[PDB]
């Protein structure tokens, strides 16, 4: 993942 | 018995003439529809198409499209036309958002990423690209804009990455509570259902029959005959008339001339750049004089 969950372009990652 | 007005004197055309510009190369169908990389929808790529033959039947061997919708033009007329100011817009979206690539649509793509004008002329092409843009574990390289303060204008591109303020407190350029990065990644996996599978979209836009054109359909040009009633085809503009040499001097950006009735009465020939007047063949009143048909 390019970011951790909740941050960057992975905001919607549960 | 009496005199009766009839139809005006008609002259039928004797032959059909096609005049297209000298164009040899094929349009970059491999560069547009078979590119290795596609842009994200927030940073959608626009490519100019010029000086080429739009013979789209070469796509029948390789390409299969789930969406092909044209707007200012019938699909069966594309081979007979020449196209002015051609651009190809390319991006990747999920399958559920292909319906948003149309004039007058709402949704997050049509509001924040890519917006078509109301009077859009061109064609929208989309096809499933799961086998190219999905990978095991997810492909997250394709982004979309989730947050924006207002809707985009038609054909506007927004590539800014300022932190969106979704609440009352200011963000001061950092992420946090109610302060989000405006671009979010698609998650493309091969096991996704259709609707969350990636779709490559190509939007073609052009103008028709108002200006000089350099992208044309695969029609062969005939010779130019003058002083005869012919059916003509000048850069897609069809009609019937008599073509004579003109004393009009066109400006270099002008292709057609029009009269007070807004009919095309002058045209520049695309191969030999001479101006030709267009005159209708049929002319002149006709009357018939008879006695009674019971008499003779």
């Amino acid at each position: 993942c390019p970011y951790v969950a909740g941050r960057x372009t992975c905001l919607x990652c549960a | 018995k009496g005199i009766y007005q009839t139809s005006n004197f008609r002259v039928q055309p004797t032959e059909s003439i096609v005049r297209f510009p000298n164009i040899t190369n094929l349009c970059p169908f491999g560069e547009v529809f078979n590119a290795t990389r596609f842009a994200s929808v927030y940073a959608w790529n626009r490519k100019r198409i010029s000086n080429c033959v739009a013979d789209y039947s070469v796509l029948y061997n390789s390409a299969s499209f789930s969406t092909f919708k044209c707007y200012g033009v019938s699909p069966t007329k594309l081979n007979d036309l020449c196209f002015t100011n051609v651009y190809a817009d390319s991006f990747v979206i999920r399958g559920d958002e292909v319906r948003q690539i149309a004039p007058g649509q709402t949704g997050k793509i049509a509001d924040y990423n890519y917006k078509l004008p109301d009077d859009f002329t061109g064609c929208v092409i989309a096809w499933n690209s799961n086998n190219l843009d999905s990978k095991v574990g997810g492909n997250y390289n394709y982004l979309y804009r989730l947050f924006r303060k207002s809707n985009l204008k038609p054909f506007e591109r927004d590539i800014s990455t300022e932190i969106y303020q979704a609440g009352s407190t200011p963000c001061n350029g950092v992420e946090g509570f109610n302060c989000y990065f405006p671009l979010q990644s698609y998650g493309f996996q091969p096991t996704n259902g259709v609707g969350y599978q990636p779709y490559r979209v190509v939007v073609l836009s052009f103008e028709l029959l108002h200006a000089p054109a350099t992208v044309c359909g695969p029609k062969k040009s005939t010779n130019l005959v003058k002083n005869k009633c012919v059916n003509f085809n000048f850069n897609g503009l069809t009609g019937t008339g008599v073509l004579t040499e003109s004393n009009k001097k066109f400006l270099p950006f002008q292709q057609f001339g029009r009269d007070i009735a807004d009919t095309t009465d002058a045209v520049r020939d695309p191969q030999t750049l001479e101006i030709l007047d267009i005159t209708p063949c049929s002319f002149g009143g006709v009357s018939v004089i008879t006695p009674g048909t019971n008499t003779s």
Binding site: - | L81, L209, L237, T238, I260, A261, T264
Partner: protein, 50 residues
């Protein structure tokens, strides 16, 4: 005035051929060069009525 009125009426008839009448164009050849017979029939029927 009689001569001028008749000439003005005929020239007004000539000038009214540029009216779109709600169609996409006032030019029959421009309509027929871009559209198939169904949508061409729609636009041409508008021009015919006008």
């Amino acid at each position: 005035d009689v001569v001028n009125q008749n000439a003005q009426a005929l020239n007004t008839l000539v000038k009214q051929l540029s009216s779109n009448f709600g169609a996409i164009s006032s030019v029959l050849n421009d309509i027929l060069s871009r559209l198939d017979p169904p949508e061409a029939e729609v636009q041409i029927d508008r021009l015919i009525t006008g």
